Amino acid sequence: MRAGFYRQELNKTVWEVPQRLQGLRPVGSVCSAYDARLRQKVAVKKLSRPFQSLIHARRTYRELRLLKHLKHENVIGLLDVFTPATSIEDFSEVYLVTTLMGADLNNIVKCQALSDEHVQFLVYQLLRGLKYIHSAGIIHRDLKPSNVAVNEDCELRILDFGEEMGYVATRWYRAPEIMLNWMHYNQTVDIWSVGCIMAELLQGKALFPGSDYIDQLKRIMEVVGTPSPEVLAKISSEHARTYIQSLPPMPQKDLSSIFRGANPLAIDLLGRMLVLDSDQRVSAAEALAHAYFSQYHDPEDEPEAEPYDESVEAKERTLEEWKELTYQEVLSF
Ligand SMILES: Cc1cn(-c2cc(NC(=O)c3ccc(C)c(Nc4nccc(-c5cccnc5)n4)c3)cc(C(F)(F)F)c2)cn1
Ligand SMILES: [Cl-]
Known part of the structure; x- marks a missing residue:
């Protein structure tokens, strides 16, 4: 020393x-x-x-x-x-x-029911930081409320900390293509996690709190709907396929009926994040331009x-x- x-x-x-x-x-x-x-x-x-x-x-x-x-x-x-x-x-x-x-985002949710304006500002910053991280060619891969730190004024920073004790399971926020062992996942995995986080800020509770791997998948499919065989093929390994194929087919649910009473703009954006096909997930950069963030959006102040x-x-x-x-x-x- x-x-x-x-x-x-x-x-x-x-x-x-x-x-x-x-x-x-x-x-x-x-x-x-x-x-x-x-x-x-x-x-x-x-x-x-x-x-x-x-x-x-x-x-x-x-x-x-x-x-x-x-x-x-x-x-x-x-x-x-x-x-x-x-x-x-x-x-x-x-x-x-x-x-x-x-504090972290769990603390926030536990103590308060967040106004729509606060949700806008929090998710806006999360996406702005994510735009920057992705422009660096970095994937976060573990976005979840305990990896997001916030001040009393709702200023937000992304971090990465790296089981029975305020524990927050990665499992609840992890993109389905990571769970299904897709070998070629990319930065869109983080957008799935942001959709899970925003859903939680809106409703005050986790969207897909799976008690285990299979329960996690069942909960996700129940909301987003079972994928076509063609889409299943691009989000999963050969072996993980059977976990999905064995579930009974589920139709996609209307997110308006899950988030009854949320700003319709919030619902619209969520529907561009919580999808199984990565081609169809909004990028962090594009998401900042969404009308849900029109209070905060500033193209000159969202750096790469x-x-x-x-x-x-x-x-x-x-x-x-x-x-x-x-x-x-x-x-x-
Ligand atoms: C091998 C590897 C590492 N990473 C990675 C590490 C970090 N590190 C920290 O966030 C970190 C390191 C050291 C410290 C002291 C902290 N600080 C920290 N850690 C836990 C909780 C809090 C905290 C909680 C509540 C309020 N304020 C701070 N701060 C973070 C951050 C990133 C990120 F997100 F930026 F991409 C990536 C990726 N690959
Ligand atoms: Cl020093």
């Missing part, structure tokens, strides 16, 4: 941090804290065994590099990165520091990202090389 760092234990895990970070409190391996250098509250994450294996080392580097890369008002912002390591020989831990927001270049992290290297590369990335921040 460096000079100017101090150590404490937070629920049987040791944290070693610089003096500038005070009052660590599990959120939570994420803590809230006050950063005395930045003069603001922050979140701090202690990565879990970052160099345990090649895949952990690759994901450690990627998380650091990706957060360096993504600078957008609706995506969690990297503010600092540190290690208690004094040199490469004892480099074993990586800590990331980001914006801290007031530079493409995230995967070339370095994709190259084969040893665990020792990964440590050296990542150490340099940490020190350069």
Whole structure:
């Protein structure tokens, strides 16, 4: 541990941090804290065994590099990165520091029935951040209420945290083509998840709360309708097909009858997100232009990202090389 760092234990895990970070409190391996250098509250994450294996080392580097890369008002912002390591020989831990927001979307839904205007503003920001992420060539793949952080004024940022305890199941928000093991899914998977999130903000409860895999699929088909064989063929592996074929056929339901009393514009947009055929899902960029967001839409203030270049992290290297590369990335921040 460096000079100017101090150590404490937070629920049987040791944290070693610089003096500038005070009052660590599990959120939570994420803590809230006050950063005395930045003069603001922050979140701090202690990565879990970052160099345990090649895949952990690759994901450690990627998380650091990706957060360096993504600078957008609706995506969690990297503010600092540190290690208690004094040199490469004892480099074993990586800590990331980001914006801290007031709460997550689950908290919001649990405490309040959201006005239509608040739903507009929240989904607008979610899509604006998503436009930026997708323009970078990045797929989120785990959008769900616990990965969306919001302030009392409804400002929103996308994050990615990475079972019996406020647990929110990925299963409830996951595109059916991911569930059915389609090997060539693309960024539209995130639009499915946004449709699930928006539905939940509108109704105050999850739209497809499956108790298991089969129950998840049954709930989805009951609303969107059983796909044709042709569409089933492009959203599933050969083996996963049978799970769908064995269900009795279900017609598509009118979303107006599910979301009785919602803004008809909200219903219209939902029907362009919650579809099985990806060709027919609205992009994040197009969705921002929808009349549901006419209060907020501003084409000059919905920016693109530079493409995230995967070339370095994709190259084969040893665990020792990964440590050296990542150490340099940490020190350069
Ligand atoms: C290998 C890999 C990683 N990622 C990825 C990681 C993150 N990381 C964080 O969101 C993250 C990292 C460190 C910290 C400290 C935080 N902060 C955090 N974590 C959990 C909860 C909260 C929180 C909750 C409520 C209010 N405010 C903050 N903040 C996030 C974010 C992304 C995203 F969304 F941008 F694409 C992608 C993708 N592939
Ligand atoms: Cl630093």
